[PDB]
């Protein structure tokens, strides 16, 4: 059974996770626009930059986030951005969200200048995680949990972060025990993703360099969050 003091957390969090949202004028381009390596890339860039804005808003609304050292907020934001994106995109492919044009969106991803070494793992992650039949709450909690990771590089008060992350993990676990009494290893399976996600940061930094040397157009926001000269 979930406590009152917890059921209030999950609600505020679940609240933020549905508050903001990507504009339909943008998300419609997965459908309308032509399908070329340039147009695909541009659209993918547009998606990322807007999502970054949604992330900040969401993250800010996370309980206790703002009491944190401002230098630590940047480190957390710059550290979970990509991982959060993978989850949102996973959700999209997994829930086959309508405003996602999954098939078409996978088209544009498959052809945007992304190395094969990266596309494969990217989708394998998508297939395996989809097969977890996650509830929007699970995605939401793993996100907040991804964002509030203490063990992020360049973090000063890592203890302060743990204090913020612990409460969510438990809420997530509590739920696992409730809605998944049959299978006890669910929670640990969920946490596994956390590691899988990490793996992708190495890969992502690569692709940024690749695109970069190919005079690929990013945005002032993305360049900031991902440290690109």
């Amino acid at each position: 059974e979930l406590t009152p003091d917890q059921q209030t957390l999950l609600h505020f969090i679940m609240d933020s996770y549905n508050k903001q949202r990507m504009p339909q004028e943008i998300t419609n381009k997965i459908l309308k626009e032509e399908f070329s390596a340039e147009e695909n890339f541009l659209i993918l860039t547009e998606m990322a930059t807007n999502h970054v804005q949604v992330l900040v808003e969401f993250t800010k609304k996370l309980p206790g986030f703002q009491t944190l050292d401002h230098e630590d907020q940047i480190a957390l934001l710059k550290g979970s951005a990509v991982e959060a994106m993978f989850l949102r995109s996973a959700e999209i492919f997994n829930k086959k969200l309508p405003s996602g044009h999954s098939d078409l969106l996978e088209e544009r991803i498959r052809n945007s200048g992304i190395s094969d070494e990266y596309i494969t793992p990217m989708f394998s992650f998508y297939k395996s995680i989809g097969e977890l039949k996650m509830t929007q709450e699970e995605y939401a909690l793993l996100t907040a949990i991804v964002i509030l990771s203490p063990d992020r590089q360049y973090i000063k008060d890592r203890e302060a972060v743990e204090k913020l992350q612990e409460p969510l993990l438990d809420v997530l676990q509590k739920l696992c025990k409730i809605h998944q009494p049959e299978n006890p290893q669910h929670f640990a399976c969920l946490l596994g993703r956390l590691t899988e996600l990490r793996t992708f940061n190495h890969h992502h930094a690569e692709m940024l360099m690749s695109w970069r040397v190919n005079d690929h157009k990013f945005t002032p926001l993305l360049c900031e969050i991902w440290d690109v000269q």
């Binding site: 804005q53 900040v56 808003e57 800010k60 401002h70 907020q73 940047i74 934001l77 710059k78 002032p220 926001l221 900031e224 969050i225």
Partner: peptide, 11 residues
């Protein structure tokens, strides 16, 4: 450093 992130965080 980080003009945009800070800015968004203050809006």
């Amino acid at each position: 450093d980080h003009q945009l992130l800070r800015y968004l965080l203050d809006k």
